[PDB]
Design an enzyme around this catalytic site. Structure first.
Site, PDB file in Angstrom:
ATOM      1  N   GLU A   1       0.777   1.486  -2.869  1.00 38.81           N
ATOM      2  CA  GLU A   1       0.435   2.219  -1.681  1.00 38.81           C
ATOM      3  C   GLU A   1      -1.001   2.778  -1.679  1.00 38.81           C
ATOM      4  O   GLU A   1      -1.636   2.958  -2.702  1.00 38.81           O
ATOM      5  CB  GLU A   1       1.367   3.416  -1.492  1.00 38.81           C
ATOM      6  CG  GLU A   1       1.225   4.512  -2.608  1.00 38.81           C
ATOM      7  CD  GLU A   1       2.105   5.694  -2.419  1.00 38.81           C
ATOM      8  OE1 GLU A   1       2.764   5.839  -1.369  1.00 38.81           O
ATOM      9  OE2 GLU A   1       2.139   6.545  -3.360  1.00 38.81           O
TER      10      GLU A   1
ATOM     11  N   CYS B   1      -2.615   3.329   4.640  1.00 35.91           N
ATOM     12  CA  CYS B   1      -1.345   2.701   4.221  1.00 35.91           C
ATOM     13  C   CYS B   1      -1.196   1.296   4.841  1.00 35.91           C
ATOM     14  O   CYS B   1      -0.883   0.307   4.177  1.00 35.91           O
ATOM     15  CB  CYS B   1      -0.133   3.597   4.588  1.00 35.91           C
ATOM     16  SG  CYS B   1       0.125   4.057   6.257  1.00 35.91           S
TER      17      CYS B   1
ATOM     18  N   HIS C   1       4.206   6.172   7.105  1.00 34.26           N
ATOM     19  CA  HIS C   1       3.652   5.571   5.923  1.00 34.26           C
ATOM     20  C   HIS C   1       4.362   4.250   5.689  1.00 34.26           C
ATOM     21  O   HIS C   1       5.460   4.004   6.152  1.00 34.26           O
ATOM     22  CB  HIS C   1       3.889   6.533   4.743  1.00 34.26           C
ATOM     23  CG  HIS C   1       3.202   6.184   3.470  1.00 34.26           C
ATOM     24  ND1 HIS C   1       1.848   6.006   3.393  1.00 34.26           N
ATOM     25  CD2 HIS C   1       3.685   6.028   2.200  1.00 34.26           C
ATOM     26  CE1 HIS C   1       1.527   5.738   2.134  1.00 34.26           C
ATOM     27  NE2 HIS C   1       2.625   5.766   1.386  1.00 34.26           N
TER      28      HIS C   1
END
EC number: 3.4.-.-
Length: 208
Positions: free
Chosen positions: A180, A119, A168
């Site tokens: 993402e 991430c 994240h």
């Protein structure tokens, strides 16, 4: 709860310092993410016609400041370049711990045999293109830039999940979608924004 329950409910990979990003074993060279990022930042500033001798290329602003090295009138351009960098990596494999300022890289653990992004690696790769140098850990990224209420997030702002943004991180694209690097065995993707586990602020790195 405190986490996006679609993802592992643990802190994201935390990779210290200024990692080696480029290696050429035939030429005998290597260079770190900070070196590659500085190079890209100088090029970006030169393309705007504003490069100065005092510019290292690192265009980072002090955490919490609404003013940075990239002029506001050029911030949309800068943000769009960062987004195009990230989007160019659509389809690259996820790899836990993977990525640097130059591109995807070998990860650690579940990502040890995969060249890809996690991430925070994707976020740091994307923003490196305009000289913004981010640490390889979502929770550390959450402590930089400027906070914007999540209800007011805008395209180019950076969305965080988990306590202290530790789980994240993604790039908001506008219109309820985000870019993402999600989880093991998946690819860099555009997906709908998820609100479970989202922090109450997004982070803005580029003012406009």
């Amino acid at each position: 709860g405190l986490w996006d329950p679609t993802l592992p409910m643990i802190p994201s990979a935390n990779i210290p310092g200024d990692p080696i990003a480029v290696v050429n074993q035939v030429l005998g060279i290597s260079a770190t993410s900070a070196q590659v990022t500085a190079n890209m930042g100088r090029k970006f500033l030169e393309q705007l016609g504003i490069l100065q001798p005092t510019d290292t290329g690192i265009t980072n602003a002090p955490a919490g400041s609404a003013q940075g090295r990239i002029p506001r009138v050029y911030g949309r351009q800068a943000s769009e370049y960062v987004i195009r960098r990230g989007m160019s990596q659509i389809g690259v494999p996820y790899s836990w711990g993977g990525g640097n300022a130059a591109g995807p890289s070998k990860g650690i653990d579940s990502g040890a045999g995969t060249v890809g992004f996690d991430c925070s690696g994707l976020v740091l790769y994307s923003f490196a293109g305009v000289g913004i140098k981010l640490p390889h850990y979502s929770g550390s990224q959450y402590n930089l830039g400027r906070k914007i209420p999540s209800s007011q997030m805008r395209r180019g702002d950076v969305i965080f999940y988990g306590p202290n943004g530790s789980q994240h991180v993604t790039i908001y694209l506008g219109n309820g979608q985000m870019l993402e690097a999600p989880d093991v065995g998946l690819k860099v993707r555009v997906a709908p924004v998820r609100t479970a586990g989202m922090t109450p602020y997004v982070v803005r790195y580029i003012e406009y």
